[PDB]
Short mmCIF file of C-alpha atoms and ligand atoms in Angstrom, two decimals:
data_model
loop_
_atom_site.label_atom_id
_atom_site.label_comp_id
_atom_site.label_asym_id
_atom_site.label_seq_id
_atom_site.Cartn_x
_atom_site.Cartn_y
_atom_site.Cartn_z
CA UNK V 825 0.00 0.00 0.00
CA UNK V 826 1.61 3.31 -1.21
CA UNK V 827 3.17 4.48 2.12
CA UNK V 828 2.11 8.19 1.58
CA UNK V 829 -1.58 7.02 1.71
CA UNK V 830 -0.94 4.69 4.71
CA UNK V 831 0.69 7.88 6.26
CA UNK V 832 -2.35 10.24 5.91
CA UNK V 833 -4.65 7.33 7.10
CA UNK V 834 -2.57 6.86 10.37
CA UNK V 835 -2.35 10.70 10.82
CA UNK V 836 -6.13 11.27 10.28
CA UNK V 837 -6.92 8.26 12.61
CA UNK V 838 -4.14 9.29 15.11
CA UNK V 839 -2.96 5.60 15.52
CA UNK V 840 0.91 6.10 15.59
CA UNK V 841 1.11 4.57 19.15
CA UNK V 842 -0.96 1.50 18.07
CA UNK V 843 1.22 0.81 14.92
CA UNK V 844 4.45 1.33 16.97
CA UNK V 845 3.27 -1.14 19.71
CA UNK V 846 2.43 -3.85 17.05
CA UNK V 847 6.11 -3.61 15.87
CA UNK V 848 7.37 -3.95 19.50
CA UNK V 849 5.07 -7.04 19.96
CA UNK V 850 6.27 -8.79 16.69
CA UNK V 851 10.02 -7.98 17.09
CA UNK V 852 12.62 -10.79 17.38
CA UNK V 853 13.97 -11.92 20.79
CA UNK V 854 17.44 -13.55 20.71
CA UNK V 855 19.96 -14.13 23.49
CA UNK V 856 22.54 -11.48 24.65
CA UNK V 857 24.50 -13.70 27.14
CA UNK V 858 27.97 -12.15 26.36
CA UNK V 859 26.63 -8.56 27.05
CA UNK V 860 25.28 -9.66 30.52
CA UNK V 861 28.57 -11.28 31.82
CA UNK V 862 29.73 -9.41 34.98
CA UNK V 863 33.22 -8.59 33.53
CA UNK V 864 31.31 -6.47 30.85
CA UNK V 865 29.12 -4.25 33.13
CA UNK V 866 31.37 -1.13 32.54
CA UNK V 867 31.28 -1.81 28.68
CA UNK V 868 27.47 -1.05 28.54
CA UNK V 869 25.97 2.47 28.75
CA UNK V 870 22.39 1.14 29.36
CA UNK V 871 21.35 -2.12 31.15
CA UNK V 872 18.31 -2.58 28.76
CA UNK V 873 20.31 -2.12 25.42
CA UNK V 874 22.50 -5.09 24.44
CA UNK V 875 23.73 -6.66 21.19
CA UNK V 876 22.41 -10.17 20.33
CA UNK V 877 25.10 -12.87 20.48
CA UNK V 878 24.48 -14.02 16.84
CA UNK V 879 25.15 -10.51 15.28
CA UNK V 880 27.59 -8.86 17.79
CA UNK V 881 30.93 -7.37 16.55
CA UNK V 882 33.95 -9.17 18.05
CA UNK V 883 37.22 -7.31 18.87
CA UNK V 884 40.34 -9.25 17.63
CA UNK V 885 41.97 -10.05 21.00
CA UNK V 886 42.04 -13.15 23.28
CA UNK V 887 41.55 -11.19 26.60
CA UNK V 888 37.95 -9.78 26.16
CA UNK V 889 36.38 -9.54 22.65
CA UNK V 890 33.25 -7.64 23.80
CA UNK V 891 31.87 -4.27 22.49
CA UNK V 892 28.23 -3.00 22.49
CA UNK V 893 27.96 -3.09 18.62
CA UNK V 894 25.90 -5.12 16.06
CA UNK V 895 26.30 -5.96 12.30
CA UNK V 896 23.00 -5.13 10.46
CA UNK V 897 23.27 -7.07 7.06
CA UNK V 898 20.51 -6.14 4.52
CA UNK V 899 20.66 -8.96 1.82
CA UNK V 900 18.23 -7.52 -0.88
CA UNK V 901 19.52 -3.91 -0.53
CA UNK V 902 23.23 -5.10 -0.53
CA UNK V 903 24.08 -2.70 2.39
CA UNK V 904 25.77 -3.45 5.80
CA UNK V 905 25.86 -1.13 8.88
CA UNK V 906 27.54 -1.39 12.29
CA UNK V 907 25.24 0.19 14.94
CA UNK V 908 26.93 0.97 18.32
CA UNK V 909 26.40 3.01 21.55
CA UNK V 910 28.20 6.33 22.10
CA UNK V 911 31.63 5.34 23.48
CA UNK V 912 32.24 5.42 27.27
CA UNK V 913 35.41 6.67 29.03
CA UNK V 914 36.71 3.05 29.27
CA UNK V 915 35.57 1.97 25.67
CA UNK V 916 37.07 4.80 23.47
CA UNK V 917 40.09 2.54 22.65
CA UNK V 918 37.77 -0.47 21.81
CA UNK V 919 35.70 1.83 19.52
CA UNK V 920 38.74 2.83 17.35
CA UNK V 921 40.04 -0.82 17.43
CA UNK V 922 36.67 -1.90 15.87
CA UNK V 923 36.85 0.90 13.18
CA UNK V 924 40.42 -0.38 12.30
CA UNK V 925 39.57 -4.17 12.34
CA UNK V 926 36.30 -3.83 10.31
CA UNK V 927 38.00 -1.51 7.65
CA UNK V 928 35.33 1.19 7.99
CA UNK V 929 35.80 4.46 5.95
CA UNK V 930 33.14 6.56 7.81
CA UNK V 931 31.78 7.17 11.38
CA UNK V 932 28.25 8.71 11.56
CA UNK V 933 27.44 10.58 14.88
CA UNK V 934 23.78 11.70 15.44
CA UNK V 935 24.10 13.23 19.00
CA UNK V 936 26.01 16.07 20.85
CA UNK V 937 28.49 15.11 23.64
CA UNK V 938 26.19 16.98 26.09
CA UNK V 939 22.36 17.05 25.74
CA UNK V 940 19.73 17.96 28.41
CA UNK V 941 22.66 18.96 30.76
CA UNK V 942 24.16 15.36 30.91
CA UNK V 943 27.00 13.56 29.06
CA UNK V 944 25.62 11.34 26.22
CA UNK V 945 29.08 10.13 24.99
CA UNK V 946 32.84 10.61 25.59
CA UNK V 947 34.88 13.26 23.67
CA UNK V 948 36.41 10.41 21.53
CA UNK V 949 38.11 12.50 18.73
CA UNK V 950 40.70 15.39 18.80
CA UNK V 951 39.46 19.02 18.63
CA UNK V 952 42.80 20.64 17.55
CA UNK V 953 45.30 19.51 14.84
CA UNK V 954 48.34 20.02 17.15
CA UNK V 955 46.82 17.89 20.04
CA UNK V 956 46.51 14.25 18.83
CA UNK V 957 45.00 11.36 20.93
CA UNK V 958 46.80 8.11 21.82
CA UNK V 959 44.77 5.05 23.05
CA UNK V 960 47.46 3.01 24.94
CA UNK V 961 45.14 0.00 25.70
CA UNK V 962 44.66 -0.68 21.86
CA UNK V 963 47.93 0.92 20.48
CA UNK V 964 46.22 3.49 18.11
CA UNK V 965 46.91 7.22 17.32
CA UNK V 966 44.20 9.62 16.02
CA UNK V 967 44.94 13.14 14.51
CA UNK V 968 42.51 15.81 13.32
CA UNK V 969 43.52 16.68 9.67
CA UNK V 970 40.65 19.10 8.68
CA UNK V 971 37.13 20.22 9.79
CA UNK V 972 34.25 21.74 7.68
CA UNK V 973 31.47 23.25 9.96
CA UNK V 974 28.05 23.85 8.28
CA UNK V 975 24.73 24.95 9.82
CA UNK V 976 23.25 21.40 10.29
CA UNK V 977 26.38 19.11 10.28
CA UNK V 978 30.20 19.06 10.52
CA UNK V 979 32.52 16.81 8.40
CA UNK V 980 35.98 16.01 9.79
CA UNK V 981 39.00 14.33 8.11
CA UNK V 982 40.88 12.12 10.69
CA UNK V 983 44.09 10.02 10.43
CA UNK V 984 44.07 6.70 12.36
CA UNK V 985 47.49 5.02 12.77
CA UNK V 986 48.02 1.42 13.91
CA UNK V 987 51.14 2.07 16.08
CA UNK V 988 52.03 -1.71 15.91
CA UNK V 989 52.47 -1.76 12.05
CA UNK V 990 52.79 2.04 11.33
CA UNK V 991 49.94 1.72 8.73
CA UNK V 992 47.64 4.81 8.49
CA UNK V 993 44.11 5.30 7.03
CA UNK V 994 41.86 8.31 6.43
CA UNK V 995 38.49 8.14 8.39
CA UNK V 996 35.63 10.61 7.63
CA UNK V 997 33.56 11.75 10.71
CA UNK V 998 30.01 12.82 9.71
CA UNK V 999 28.48 14.70 12.71
CA UNK V 1000 24.77 15.69 12.58
CA UNK V 1001 24.70 18.51 15.24
CA UNK V 1002 21.05 19.86 15.18
CA UNK V 1003 18.81 16.93 16.27
CA UNK V 1004 16.63 18.57 19.04
CA UNK V 1005 17.08 17.63 22.77
CA UNK V 1006 13.31 16.60 22.82
CA UNK V 1007 11.19 15.03 20.00
CA UNK V 1008 12.23 14.79 16.25
CA UNK V 1009 12.96 17.48 13.58
CA UNK V 1010 9.85 19.24 12.12
CA UNK V 1011 11.18 18.76 8.50
CA UNK V 1012 13.35 15.81 7.27
CA UNK V 1013 15.09 18.14 4.77
CA UNK V 1014 18.43 18.59 6.66
CA UNK V 1015 18.57 14.85 7.74
CA UNK V 1016 18.13 13.72 4.02
CA UNK V 1017 20.79 16.30 2.90
CA UNK V 1018 23.14 14.73 5.54
CA UNK V 1019 22.39 11.12 4.38
CA UNK V 1020 23.20 12.15 0.74
CA UNK V 1021 26.56 13.68 1.89
CA UNK V 1022 27.48 10.39 3.65
CA UNK V 1023 26.54 8.43 0.44
CA UNK V 1024 28.60 10.78 -1.83
CA UNK V 1025 31.71 10.15 0.34
CA UNK V 1026 31.89 6.41 -0.58
CA UNK V 1027 31.51 5.48 3.17
CA UNK V 1028 28.36 3.31 2.51
CA UNK V 1029 29.87 1.50 -0.55
CA UNK V 1030 31.02 -2.19 -0.88
CA UNK V 1031 34.70 -1.31 -1.49
CA UNK V 1032 34.96 -0.42 2.30
CA UNK V 1033 33.97 -2.17 5.55
CA UNK V 1034 30.56 -1.22 7.02
CA UNK V 1035 29.92 2.36 8.17
CA UNK V 1036 29.91 2.76 12.03
CA UNK V 1037 26.69 4.56 13.17
CA UNK V 1038 25.94 5.83 16.75
CA UNK V 1039 23.78 8.10 18.93
CA UNK V 1040 23.65 7.67 22.75
CA UNK V 1041 22.17 4.07 22.90
CA UNK V 1042 22.74 3.21 19.18
CA UNK V 1043 19.04 2.25 18.50
CA UNK V 1044 16.88 5.42 18.08
CA UNK V 1045 18.37 8.15 15.78
CA UNK V 1046 20.83 5.40 14.57
CA UNK V 1047 17.78 3.24 13.65
CA UNK V 1048 16.21 6.14 11.67
CA UNK V 1049 19.46 6.69 9.64
CA UNK V 1050 19.76 2.98 8.44
CA UNK V 1051 15.95 2.45 7.92
CA UNK V 1052 15.72 5.56 5.64
CA UNK V 1053 18.85 4.63 3.61
CA UNK V 1054 17.75 0.95 3.03
CA UNK V 1055 14.12 1.91 2.13
CA UNK V 1056 15.25 4.53 -0.54
CA UNK V 1057 17.79 2.02 -2.04
CA UNK V 1058 15.03 -0.67 -2.37
CA UNK V 1059 12.72 1.95 -4.07
CA UNK V 1060 15.55 2.53 -6.70
CA UNK V 1061 16.20 -1.22 -7.31
CA UNK V 1062 12.62 -2.74 -7.57
CA UNK V 1063 10.22 -2.58 -10.62
CA UNK V 1064 7.41 -1.39 -8.28
CA UNK V 1065 8.73 1.16 -5.71
CA UNK V 1066 5.27 1.19 -3.97
CA UNK V 1067 5.95 -2.48 -2.90
CA UNK V 1068 8.52 -1.23 -0.28
CA UNK V 1069 6.97 -1.86 3.18
CA UNK V 1070 8.80 0.27 5.86
CA UNK V 1071 7.33 -1.76 8.81
CA UNK V 1072 8.60 -5.03 7.23
CA UNK V 1073 12.08 -3.52 6.60
CA UNK V 1074 12.21 -2.35 10.29
CA UNK V 1075 11.26 -5.90 11.57
CA UNK V 1076 14.04 -7.42 9.34
CA UNK V 1077 16.60 -4.91 10.85
CA UNK V 1078 15.31 -5.77 14.42
CA UNK V 1079 16.48 -9.41 13.83
CA UNK V 1080 20.05 -7.93 14.13
CA UNK V 1081 19.77 -5.30 16.96
CA UNK V 1082 16.97 -4.82 19.56
CA UNK V 1083 14.87 -1.64 19.95
CA UNK V 1084 15.59 0.12 16.60
CA UNK V 1085 13.25 3.20 16.50
CA UNK V 1086 12.57 4.13 20.18
CA UNK V 1087 9.25 6.14 19.96
CA UNK V 1088 6.07 6.52 17.79
CA UNK V 1089 7.39 10.02 16.80
CA UNK V 1090 10.69 8.47 15.44
CA UNK V 1091 8.53 5.94 13.44
CA UNK V 1092 6.45 8.84 11.93
CA UNK V 1093 9.66 10.84 11.15
CA UNK V 1094 11.11 7.70 9.33
CA UNK V 1095 7.98 7.54 7.05
CA UNK V 1096 8.26 11.35 6.43
CA UNK V 1097 11.96 11.09 5.44
CA UNK V 1098 11.39 8.13 3.02
CA UNK V 1099 8.29 9.78 1.39
CA UNK V 1100 10.16 13.10 0.89
CA UNK V 1101 13.46 11.46 -0.16
CA UNK V 1102 11.63 9.37 -2.84
CA UNK V 1103 10.69 12.67 -4.67
CA UNK V 1104 14.47 12.78 -5.60
CA UNK V 1105 15.00 8.93 -6.03
CA UNK V 1106 12.04 9.01 -8.57
CA UNK V 1107 13.74 11.33 -11.04
CA UNK V 1108 13.74 14.94 -9.74
N1 LIG F 1451 44.90 19.19 0.89
N2 LIG F 1451 46.13 18.56 1.12
C1 LIG F 1451 46.17 17.43 1.97
S1 LIG F 1451 44.79 16.88 2.69
N3 LIG F 1451 47.48 16.88 2.15
C2 LIG F 1451 47.68 15.63 3.01
C3 LIG F 1451 47.29 15.67 4.56
C4 LIG F 1451 46.55 14.42 5.15
C5 LIG F 1451 45.33 13.96 4.55
C6 LIG F 1451 44.61 12.83 5.04
C7 LIG F 1451 45.13 12.16 6.14
CL1 LIG F 1451 44.23 10.77 6.75
C8 LIG F 1451 46.31 12.55 6.76
C9 LIG F 1451 47.01 13.68 6.25
#
């Protein structure tokens, strides 16, 4: 059912809460036993947000291989995403180890370090060229190369160096800076512009490892980013773009990480972004 019509029908009937709860009821439940081991309590920002064992990213070390991060693999769209929490003071080194090991080109950040007067994630990247960061636990060096500040987002060029082998790579940091402290944006225009800048970079393409995407918990804003991308790609690929069912794509993605899309307002915003983005995808 053409999603724009399904949209006006849910809006006129005011049933966003009822649709959202049906998704929560049908969603997959898989074990997260590694996440709940006592040695990992300080590796988790939230007690109720864990990666499933079957889809979790493993760090390449014999000691403790655990990070709060999941591989979302979309078979028909031919896209992969890593979704992760905002790094903690004791997981900043693990975060950059995962970027290195998975061969990612891009990091997508959808939150500010401080929101609502509290810390939502660690200051995990350098703010001045001349003041580089060293992570001694994972033997990595990170340098700020350049920064381009726009009204809705910032793009940064970083150098990550594996101090063990002296190999270096360029990482792009895409930072969406204007998501409001409460609710969702009124228009999806600046979010869609941001998604098209990430795509243009090559960060989402098969010649690199998966893009790393985060917010505070790595399920809400992060969920919106990957749901919109995948839905617009399927609308480009299929003979009938009106066959794309956003609720079915979201349940497929929830097989790989729990809780993706945290509120009925984030679900409505996801429909709005796909509907509006399609008026470029279909030829404009
Ligand atoms: N416009 N001229 C440039 S960018 N020269 C090279 C500087 C550089 C670039 C990328 C990385 Cl990862 C590290 C260092």
